[PDB]
Design an enzyme around this catalytic site. Structure first.
Site, short mmCIF file in Angstrom:
data_model
loop_
_atom_site.label_atom_id
_atom_site.label_comp_id
_atom_site.label_asym_id
_atom_site.label_seq_id
_atom_site.Cartn_x
_atom_site.Cartn_y
_atom_site.Cartn_z
N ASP A 154 0.84 -1.20 0.00
CA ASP A 154 0.00 0.00 0.00
C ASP A 154 0.87 1.25 0.00
O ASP A 154 1.82 1.35 0.77
CB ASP A 154 -0.82 0.10 1.30
CG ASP A 154 -1.65 -1.13 1.61
OD1 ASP A 154 -1.40 -2.23 1.08
OD2 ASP A 154 -2.56 -0.98 2.45
N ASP A 175 -0.85 -3.08 -4.21
CA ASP A 175 -2.02 -3.02 -3.34
C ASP A 175 -2.59 -1.61 -3.43
O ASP A 175 -2.29 -0.87 -4.38
CB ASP A 175 -1.68 -3.49 -1.91
CG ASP A 175 -2.87 -4.14 -1.21
OD1 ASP A 175 -3.96 -3.52 -1.15
OD2 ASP A 175 -2.72 -5.27 -0.71
N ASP A 176 -3.41 -1.23 -2.46
CA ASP A 176 -4.14 0.04 -2.53
C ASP A 176 -3.20 1.21 -2.78
O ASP A 176 -2.12 1.30 -2.18
CB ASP A 176 -4.91 0.27 -1.23
CG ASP A 176 -6.13 -0.60 -1.12
OD1 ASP A 176 -6.80 -0.79 -2.17
OD2 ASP A 176 -6.41 -1.09 -0.01
N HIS A 197 -4.27 -1.91 -6.25
CA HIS A 197 -5.64 -2.33 -6.02
C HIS A 197 -6.61 -1.16 -5.94
O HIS A 197 -7.75 -1.35 -5.51
CB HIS A 197 -5.74 -3.23 -4.77
CG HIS A 197 -5.04 -4.55 -4.93
ND1 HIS A 197 -5.05 -5.53 -3.95
CD2 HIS A 197 -4.29 -5.05 -5.95
CE1 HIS A 197 -4.35 -6.57 -4.37
NE2 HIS A 197 -3.87 -6.30 -5.57
N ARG A 230 -12.83 1.97 -5.12
CA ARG A 230 -13.29 0.93 -4.21
C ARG A 230 -13.65 1.49 -2.84
O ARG A 230 -12.89 2.27 -2.27
CB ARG A 230 -12.24 -0.18 -4.03
CG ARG A 230 -12.59 -1.14 -2.88
CD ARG A 230 -11.87 -2.46 -3.01
NE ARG A 230 -10.44 -2.31 -2.73
CZ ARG A 230 -9.62 -3.33 -2.51
NH1 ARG A 230 -10.07 -4.58 -2.55
NH2 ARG A 230 -8.34 -3.11 -2.27
N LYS A 232 -14.63 -0.45 0.74
CA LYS A 232 -14.73 -1.77 1.36
C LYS A 232 -14.97 -1.61 2.85
O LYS A 232 -14.13 -1.05 3.56
CB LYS A 232 -13.47 -2.61 1.08
CG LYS A 232 -12.15 -1.85 1.10
CD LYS A 232 -10.95 -2.81 0.98
CE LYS A 232 -9.65 -2.03 0.79
NZ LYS A 232 -8.42 -2.89 0.91
#
Length: 336
Positions: A154, A175-176, A197, A230, A232
């Site tokens: 991240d 990742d993010d 991500h 996104r 979540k």
């Protein structure tokens, strides 16, 4: 006094007595933090040359800075090189080797970080837990992680923070690009996110702080990433996500979901059944556009019963891939 250090032990011993701290080509001992916490208010910190880190299995952080009215700068050509392939095993923070988080900005308040380049982080990069902190012209070069096993890399993790502004970030990771676990009055603008991500609110829930309020993610591009936009929220958790705006986001080459908002999230795998303890209210998407890859899903909304309301969804257009057959509890004025 102005101070220049070529070793970490001297910098840590003398940091409070220096109002300008230049860190030149420091090799940080294995298993230790370049610990620049507790700085005298007003101090300027400059990273010069290439900062490196010894190898040891441990949780980090490799670098930590704290204080009020601190100015952190990366000089031209400077790099904080984690050489993370030494740890990378495809498993990140889920298992395998224990891997150190990179850069803690905890209580780095009324402060700024500018022009820092991170290369090949072992795992997550910035852990942001501060008030009134700007991060400008940050570069995360984790491209080698695409083929050498990078995972959970991240770029910006935010929790228990207020007034965070990230401007002109450039991230290539696994990742993010941003993950807002909690915080208020957050801006991410002018970013370029690739490999990772997506631009994520969350995961929200399961922590001490599970409140997200007034976050704007805008004027940014997400490419060649698992997700574009996104949100979540954690399965069975309690929290709140309100006043979130994604605006003027472009995406392309997205492999899983152009836009995904799901209330069944778990780290291992989403459950497929949403819960309603983390309401998402006053969510605005304004001009979120682009394309996904042929095996991808354009938009996926999996909301719990009553926990998604009062959304504004204008200029949303995601092409390519397929339409979802799994959306649940879609709010008025919204579509998969």
């Amino acid at each position: 006094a102005s101070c220049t250090f070529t070793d970490a032990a001297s910098a840590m011993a003398s940091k409070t007595a220096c109002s300008t701290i230049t860190l030149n080509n420091i090799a940080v001992p294995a298993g230790t933090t370049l610990d620049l916490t507790g700085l005298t208010s007003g101090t300027r910190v400059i990273f010069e040359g290439t900062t490196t880190f010894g190898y040891q299995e441990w949780s980090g952080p490799l670098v930590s800075i704290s204080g009020t009215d601190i100015t952190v700068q990366g000089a031209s050509g400077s790099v904080l090189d984690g050489d993370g392939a030494r740890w990378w095993d495809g498993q990140g923070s889920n298992g395998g080797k224990t891997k150190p988080k990179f850069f803690y900005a905890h209580s780095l308040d009324s402060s700024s970080i500018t022009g820092i380049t991170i290369k090949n982080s072992p795992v997550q990069v910035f852990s942001i837990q501060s008030n009134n902190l700007s991060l400008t012209d940050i570069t995360v070069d984790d491209a080698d992680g695409d083929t050498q096993g990078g995972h959970n890399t991240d770029a910006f993790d935010i929790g228990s923070s207020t007034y965070i502004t990230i401007t002109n970030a450039n991230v290539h990771n696994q990742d993010d690009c941003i993950a807002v676990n909690s915080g208020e009055n957050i801006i991410f603008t002018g970013g370029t996110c690739t490999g990772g991500h997506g631009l994520s609110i969350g995961s929200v829930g399961g922590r001490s702080d599970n409140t997200v309020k007034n976050v704007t993610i805008e004027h940014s591009t997400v490419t060649n990433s698992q997700n574009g936009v996104r949100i979540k929220t954690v399965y069975g958790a309690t929290g709140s996500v309100s006043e979130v705006t994604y605006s003027n986001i472009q995406m392309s080459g997205i492999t899983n979901y152009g836009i995904v908002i799901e209330q069944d999230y778990e780290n291992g795998s989403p459950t497929g059944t949403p819960t309603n303890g983390v309401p998402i209210t006053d969510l605005t998407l304004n001009t979120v556009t682009g394309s996904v890859s042929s095996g991808a899903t354009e938009i996926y909304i999996l909301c719990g019963s009553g926990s998604c309301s009062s959304w504004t969804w204008t200029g949303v257009s995601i092409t390519g891939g397929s339409k979802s057959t799994k959306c649940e509890n879609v709010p008025s004025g919204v579509s998969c």
